[PDB]
């Protein structure tokens, strides 16, 4: 794949659209695009495993893992390909993304196409919470919105 | 794949769940699953080349056909890769979709996933109806609702 999009929706206030290019088979992912309805700071932003929305974002499952690793942040080597990071809002509860990420892909292995994405209530602590939790989804808490990763023009 | 999942919505009463299930890469993928909200009889049932909603339905674009040919019912050898045809809904509203089909793929040139599946308004006359709008949607009408095909568990 090229081009990928993302809409972000809720029971809440979040909603966003987020943008996925990856120019060629191998390598880095660029991410980009916009969610508002946030409270200023850091929040959670995740690949969930499966791209099922039967039950809100609850059915997405657990973060995107198929190397078996433990939570991080997208830049440690021990990461679930999922990981993401932060994304931060604004005073005005909006978050511009920008993120190049070369763990996850768009082809191969690691393609996270019908998958999806998550925004989380609070800060990813990137595997340094000193808890179960935080090897698993970095304490972000509740998901407030959430779309299936699915193929652009 | 052998297990994905749609969650169909849109801006009126339309709503379900449809589920795709494939065993060999080959290989034939059964589909089924509930439609509510339906006026009683024939609704066209696509898949639309693009997973992308930021615009409803229509942002889904055309159907999936990367062969390049003109619209058909799923069993013409002259159809696109999205066309599954009509379902039909009862007069309680409510489609139970059963099919099986081998020309869309969980995987390869006609996968599916990250693509979008739609209801549509109308039958779908399978290219049947005369004029250049059958050769193209099957004259099924407008969007009624729509989901990005994800991954199931
Ligand atoms: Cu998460
Ligand atoms: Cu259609
Ligand atoms: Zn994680
Ligand atoms: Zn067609």
Redo the contacts between chains.
Sequence with gaps: ?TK??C?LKGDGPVQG?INFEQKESNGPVKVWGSIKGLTEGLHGFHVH??????AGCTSA?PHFNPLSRKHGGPKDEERHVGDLGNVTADKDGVADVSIEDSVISLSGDHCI????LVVHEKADDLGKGGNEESTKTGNAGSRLAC???????
Aim: proline letters at 0%.
């Design positions: 794949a990928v999009v809409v659209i495993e499966f791209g099922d929305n039967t499952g196409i019908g998958r999806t779309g299936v990763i699915g193929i652009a023009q």
